């Protein structure tokens, strides 16, 4: 019965690089992590100033 438990669809929330279920996510892992950390780095550069 736990085999009935499918995970809901998050297509409304996924980023564009993660929409295709047949493409590996490793191809965009560095870019996606780099963007959110660039936001953090620029934020720290602002508070430092």
């Amino acid at each position: 019965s736990h085999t009935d438990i499918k995970v809901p669809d998050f297509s409304d929330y996924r980023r564009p690089e993660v929409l295709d279920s047949t493409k590996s996510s490793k191809e965009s892992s560095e870019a996606r992590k780099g963007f959110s950390y660039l936001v953090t780095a620029t934020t720290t550069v602002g508070v430092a100033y």
Binding site: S1, H2, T3, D4, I5, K6, V7, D9, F10, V18, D20, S21, T22, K23, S24, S25, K26, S29, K33
Partner: protein, 446 residues
């Protein structure tokens, strides 16, 4: 007098042959009086669609229940009467049927496997009987938290892809699966280029290849139609699934990152790193003096009843991580010590412990290939995944190449600052939030 390196050379070469219809035939001869023979098929739930999911697991229930030439009990009575044993299993990528029998019973054993794989009856009266049986098995599996939490891990890690599907299938598909769905599954996937006849024990490769021509020749091969299956990649998703159930006395947690897949050379170094972390159970004798810091701390402070690392391999993908079970107030401490060892190996692995991981792997590899049935499995599965039998001397070469630098580079490539797939089940109120888990995949000091 013979050294360990010399003993690896003494293992007989695994002879491989291929019929004209694409059926590969592999064997490893020994002096044993017994043997194991079976057919490994490149089929599983990853090939099934949502509508016919669980069809392979359904066929497994029907494979031994009757054939055109041996209807009903006839197959069992032949196997049982010669003291042989008949078994089968199905993963997400491989299906297998194998027999254990005497060496003199080799021709009868191969003959039965041919009649099973090719001429399955699939009587409608039997399909309805196995319909209720699989449903009971689904209720049974629900009580195994380990089977549940690993299905959840696949469900969330490979969400939206075939690998998310479980082998047994959902309860609704077992109820509406018709005989036509199953025959469609067989003619589509049980094709000679996708099967491997493996044997191991006391037998010459000639008589196996002769029996392969004698019984498996009548099988369409090398060109079926324009209906060729091909496994596309499967997206990995960093995600979390939490089944809160405070009625169960112990929580189950499975956490993992994306692995590379079968053919990648990095699996050797990953298994060395997993061997350093190792595994623990409350019945182990070592306790506080164990080498693995996670096992030592888990036994000293009683953080869990058990844990195990794993490196599950699929085509071009896999699940690399660990699974544990513990009291409801130890889920946080256990996750902290676990992630701290991934980070410690990513950044500051040392040479001695890496040698231990190589030695644990050498012992594990030779201890596993002891018996005709393990070796027959290694032959069948390897020919589907690797396209060859990798000799033990080659595994020793790849293990001996690993050092502390390889582990630091290889572990960082797959662990450091990566989104894990988390699956939880039981009293998991204290299971850390995913962001806190994601923050445990890097160190601010590094």
């Amino acid at each position: 007098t013979a050294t360990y390196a010399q003993a690896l050379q003494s293992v007989p070469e695994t002879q491989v042959s291929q019929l004209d219809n694409g059926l590969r035939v592999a064997s490893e001869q020994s002096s044993q009086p017994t043997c194991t023979v079976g057919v490994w098929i490149d089929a599983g739930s990853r090939y099934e669609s949502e509508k016919n999911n669980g069809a392979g697991y359904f066929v497994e229930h029907l494979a031994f229940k009757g054939t055109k030439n041996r209807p009903g009990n006839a197959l069992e009575k032949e196997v049982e009467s010669m003291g042989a044993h008949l078994n089968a299993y199905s993963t997400r990528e491989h299906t297998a049927y194998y027999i254990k029998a005497l060496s003199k019973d080799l021709p009868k054993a191969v003959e039965l496997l041919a009649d099973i794989v090719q001429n399955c009856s699939l009587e409608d009266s039997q399909i309805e009987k196995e319909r209720d049986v699989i449903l009971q098995e689904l209720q049974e599996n629900d009580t195994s938290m380990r089977d549940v939490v690993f299905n959840y891990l696949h469900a969330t890690a490979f969400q939206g892809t075939p690998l998310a599907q479980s082998v047994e299938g959902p309860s609704e598909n077992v109820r509406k699966l018709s005989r036509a769905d199953l025959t469609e599954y067989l003619s589509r996937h049980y094709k000679a280029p996708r099967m491997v006849l493996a044997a191991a024990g006391g037998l010459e490769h000639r008589q196996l290849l002769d029996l392969a021509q004698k019984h498996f020749s009548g099988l369409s091969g090398t060109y079926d139609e324009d209906a060729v299956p091909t496994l596309s990649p499967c997206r990995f998703t960093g995600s979390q699934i939490c089944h809160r159930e405070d009625g169960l006395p112990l929580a189950h947690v499975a956490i993992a990152v994306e692995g590379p897949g079968w053919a990648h050379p990095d699996n050797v170094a990953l298994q060395v790193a997993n061997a350093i972390i190792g595994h623990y159970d409350c019945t182990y004798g070592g306790g506080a003096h164990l080498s693995s810091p996670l096992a030592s701390i888990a036994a000293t402070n009683k953080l869990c009843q058990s844990f195990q690392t794993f490196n599950i391999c699929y085509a071009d993908t896999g699940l690399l991580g660990a699974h544990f079970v513990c009291d409801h107030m130890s889920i946080d401490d256990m996750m902290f010590v676990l992630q701290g060892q991934w980070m410690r190996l990513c950044t500051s692995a040392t040479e001695s412990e890496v040698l231990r991981g190589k030695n644990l792997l050498r012992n594990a590899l030779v201890s596993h290939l002891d018996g005709t049935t393990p070796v027959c499995e290694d032959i069948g599965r390897s020919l589907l995944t690797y396209g060859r039998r990798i000799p033990l001397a080659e595994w020793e070469s790849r293990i001996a190449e690993v050092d502390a630098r390889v582990v630091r580079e290889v572990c960082s490539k797959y662990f450091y600052d990566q989104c894990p797939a988390v699956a939880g089940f039981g009293p998991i109120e204290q299971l850390p939030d995913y962001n806190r888990i994601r923050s445990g995949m890097f160190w601010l000091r590094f």
